[PDB]
Amino acid sequence: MWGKVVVIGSGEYGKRAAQRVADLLDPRIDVYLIFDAKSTDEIRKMIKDHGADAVIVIGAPLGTAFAIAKAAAELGAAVIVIIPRRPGVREAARRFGEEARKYGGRVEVLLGATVEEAVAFARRVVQQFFALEHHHHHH
């Protein structure tokens, strides 16, 4: 296996998108799928035991998604955060991204997209995250 990705989906949109992402990720990725995140501390332990390279958090409530993603970033994982359409979340998401980026990891956020756009966004970021380093600029 090439790496370890944890996929967490909460709520109706998040669970559907999370299942599709897990179904469509390259089989060389070791994927751990979790539905309906409740305890941030329990998620944190499951992220530590899986030794996650990246954590994909999809759905709502926003406060939970951001809390999970911050905990993953604190553990050194790349994070991909995908929030279903909600009004007025732009500045909250900008502040989350600024805080999560203080850890120095990769932080990617998608707001208000369809399920299939969410799936494509997760797949594109994971594709980049697993790319070989034969290029010029590096994170």
CB 20 within 8 A of CB 115: yes
The tokens 């998608």 sit on which residue? 110
Resolution in angstroms comes to: 1.9
CB 21 within 8 A of CB 81: no
Calpha distance 111→98 (Å, rounded): 15
Calpha distance 42→103 (Å, rounded): 21
* Structure-determination technique: X-ray
Q: Would you call 35 helix, strand, or coil by DSSP?
A: strand
Q: Would you call 26 helix, strand, or coil by DSSP?
A: coil
Tokens for 2, please give them. 């090439």
Strand-pairing partners, residue 81, are 57, 109
CB 33 within 8 A of CB 22: yes
Calpha distance 97→105 (Å, rounded): 11
Side chain identity, residue 118: A
Written in H, E and C, the secondary structure of 56-125 is EEEECCHHHHHHHHHHHHHCCCEEEEEECCCCCCHHHHHHHHHHHHCCCCCEEEEECCCHHHHHHHHHHH
CB 38 within 8 A of CB 44: no
123-128 long-range contacts, Cβ below 8 Å, gap at least 24?
123/21, 123/24, 123/25, 125/80, 126/5, 126/25, 126/26, 126/29, 126/54, 126/56, 126/80
Strand-pairing partners, residue 34, are 8
